[PDB]
């Protein structure tokens, strides 16, 4: 009955962040109670033939809760999740909200070894994956966990086997029993987003913290009800989650459109299909999609934002983005720990076309620094340290790492190499280890 451990912000911080309006303390399904409230019949999820409106989603995701809540999973339980580029993966995300599990969602492209490790540090109960990636092709690492004392209490398979439990019988039929269930607390923690060398780092993301970057960040973005995002990156990541991603998507009441990966001839299809007008990606997939979007011109011509984060995203390539892709671009630096910075939609050519951006909230705290910590001159180099409103406290259960990367005032050191430019935005120009 102990809910995960976590650090906390300190009291002083925390009443700061209610008093400005930016921790309202509701659990992250408020996004999809409220838009159940204001437009139950607007599209939230297109993904292939499918299209799930706000009140089918929250039906679903509240069918799988009641079946989880049955089983005695709830509050002070952890889960892991694993799962490609589909509906599914919204629809329990959203369960587990509601339920109160604590949910880390790996990447598709994570292995055994990965997930072994996510499994010993979490302890889950619960287990979603598919038939149809590797780790799960045949019983081998499922039945390792026993040899371990770390098997789940429950799994759960797409593509399920006809001896499996089925992940969309558990959606589609509400449990015999009702078993009472709810959130985690608003300032507790809702899930594990991911560091992005060694396994991924867990880092507790509450709902106040989270909520916030995506109510914010949907309003940087400009957001509204017309919004269909494209979602080609994987699922999971902060970037394509919150940033503002499908949750800032739904929080501004408009609808995602499932791809399986960045590849152009399909994802030019799928814009075409569903009048795509939002998409977000990283450099190495924008070069491929400028290496079409010439010939397939008449495919993507409602795209009207696309987001860049990533690596290096020099002048010259960001330049092509609103002259092949003819949308307006929009560069993004930031990190799953935290800060996240936009260029404004306003900002000059200049400003969009060769920095990435300023961090979402007034009150993110940005220190730039030199080898002995002391702040540089303005405009100089220096390596990035921070805190603010949506910013971690720590890592789960790892004391040592933590203090390593935390300074006294709890600021965090993401290791980026960064300049502030003299019209206020940042430049990301290298990293240190
Ligand atoms: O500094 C970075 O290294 C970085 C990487 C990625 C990123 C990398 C891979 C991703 O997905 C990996 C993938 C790419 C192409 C096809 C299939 C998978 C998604 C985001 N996104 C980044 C980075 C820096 N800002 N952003 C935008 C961002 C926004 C919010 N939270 C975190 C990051
Ligand atoms: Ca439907
Ligand atoms: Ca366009
Ligand atoms: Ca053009
Ligand atoms: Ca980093």
């Known amino acids: 009955k102990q809910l995960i451990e976590f650090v906390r912000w300190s009291p002083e911080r925390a009443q700061h962040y209610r008093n400005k309006g930016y921790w309202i303390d509701q659990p992250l399904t408020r996004i999809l109670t409220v838009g159940v409230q204001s437009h139950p019949h607007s599209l939230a999820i297109i993904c292939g033939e499918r299209q799930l409106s706000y009140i089918e989603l929250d039906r679903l995701s509240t069918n799988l809760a009641t079946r989880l809540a049955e089983k005695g999973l709830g509050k002070g339980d952890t889960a892991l999740v694993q799962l490609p580029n589909v509906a599914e993966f919204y629809i329990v995300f959203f369960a587990l909200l509601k339920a109160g599990v604590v949910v880390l969602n790996a990447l598709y492209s994570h292995r055994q070894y990965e997930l072994n490790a996510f499994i010993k540090q979490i302890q889950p109960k619960l287990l979603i994956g598919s038939r149809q990636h590797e780790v799960f092709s045949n019983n081998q690492f499922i039945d390792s966990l026993h040899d371990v004392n770390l098997s789940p209490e429950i799994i759960l398979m797409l593509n399920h086997q006809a001896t499996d439990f089925g992940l969309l019988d558990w959606i589609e039929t509400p449990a015999e029993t009702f078993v009472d269930f709810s959130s985690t607390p608003a300032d507790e923690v809702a899930f594990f987003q991911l560091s992005g060398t060694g396994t991924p780092k867990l880092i507790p993301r509450t709902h106040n913290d989270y909520d916030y970057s995506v109510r914010a960040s949907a309003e940087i973005c400009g957001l509204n009800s017309n919004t269909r995002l494209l979602c080609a990156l994987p699922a999971p990541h902060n970037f394509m989650l919150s940033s503002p991603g499908a949750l800032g998507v739904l929080h501004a009441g408009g609808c995602v459109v499932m791809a399986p990966n960045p590849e152009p001839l399909n994802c030019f299809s799928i814009i075409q299909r ?125 004391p040592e790492h933590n203090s390593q990367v935390f300074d006294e005032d709890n600021y965090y050191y993401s290791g980026d190499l960064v300049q502030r430019t003299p019209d206020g935005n940042l430049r990301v120009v290298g990293r240190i280890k």
């Open 274 to 398: 569903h009048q795509v007008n939002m998409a977000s990606l990283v450099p190495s997939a924008v070069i491929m999609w400028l290496e079409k979007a010439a010939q397939y011109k008449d495919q993507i011509q409602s795209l009207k934002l696309l987001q860049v984060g990533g690596a290096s995203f020099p002048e010259s390539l960001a330049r092509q983005v609103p002259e092949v892709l003819n949308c307006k671009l929009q560069q993004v630096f930031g990190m799953a720990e935290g800060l996240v910075n936009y260029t404004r939609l306003d900002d000059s050519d200049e400003q969009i076309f060769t920095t990435q951006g300023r961090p979402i909230s007034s009150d993110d705290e940005i220190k730039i620094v030199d080898e002995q910590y002391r702040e540089v001159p303005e405009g100089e180099i220096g390596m990035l340290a921070t805190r603010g409103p949506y910013t971690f406290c720590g890592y789960y259960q790892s």
